[PDB]
């Protein structure tokens, strides 16, 4: 079917992450971001990817990895889930819950309760519908899901911490000339 009525959100800008496990380069993940749907949340993520406020994601780690669930990163101040901050302050409100965690590869803000978005985020590796309405969804992996899967399956300890650090060796913004809708899947 042509699915005119099933068009999802528009990708308005992209972010890339070049990842490492230990000292091994493992490839690039490209995330499409929904700047019409959640502009404030997208703008934060993009600025943290460029580093333009003087802090951000470069060389931070994915400190929590749960196979068949998600990979979590963005704590560039403490690397352990205790830190991070947004470009608006330590915390900012949940912008909206228009988007759901539709399937593998959706990108959503980590939080410690209502209105506690900072810099931490997660990339789902399955549909995580139980987070719908609680975590703000703002992007989807468009390229390099296989690289996400490498992280997903890295050995972890009993605290779900990778045994070897998984780091964002490089990151930045990629402009999108014409925004484009993707499927909610
Ligand atoms: Zn080595
Ligand atoms: Zn939660």
Residue numbers in the entry: -1 to 183
From the primary publication:
CypB is a peptidyl prolyl cis-trans-isomerase (PPIase) found in the endoplasmic reticulum (ER). CypB plays a significant role in the triple helix folding of collagen. It catalyzes the slow cistrans isomerization of multiple proline residues in the collagen chain. Here, we present the crystal structures of recombinantly produced wild-type and HC-mutant CypB from the horse.
Wild-type and HC CypB were crystallized using the same crystallization conditions in space group C2 with one molecule per asymmetric unit. While slightly weaker, electron density in this region was sufficient to unambiguously model the wild-type structure. The presence of two recombinantly added amino acids (Ala-Met) preceding the natural sequence in our constructs of both HC and normal CypB accounts for a partial stabilization of the N-terminal segment via charge/polar contacts of Ala(−1) with His133 of a neighbor molecule (a zinc ion coordinates this interaction) and hydrophobic environment for Met0 formed by residues Met68, Ala108 and Phe120 of the adjacent molecule. The conformations of N-terminal sequences are only partially populated as revealed by the difference map, therefore variable occupancies were allowed for residues ranging from Ala(−1) to Lys(5). Moreover, weak difference densities from Fo-Fc maps in the vicinity of Ala(−1) to Lys5 suggest that the structure might adopt alternate conformations in this region, but only one conformation could be modeled. The N-terminal sequences appear to be the most flexible, with refined B-factors higher than average. The recently reported crystal structure of human CypB complexed with the proline-rich P-domain of calmegin reveals that the binding involves the N-terminal region of cyclophilin and the surfaces of CypB and P-domain are complementary. The N-terminal region forms part of the P-domain binding interface, contributing several hydrogen bonds. Interactions of CypB with ERp72 and GRp94 also require the N-terminal tail as confirmed by NMR experiments with the strongest chemical shifts observed for residues Lys3, Lys4, Lys5, Lys8.
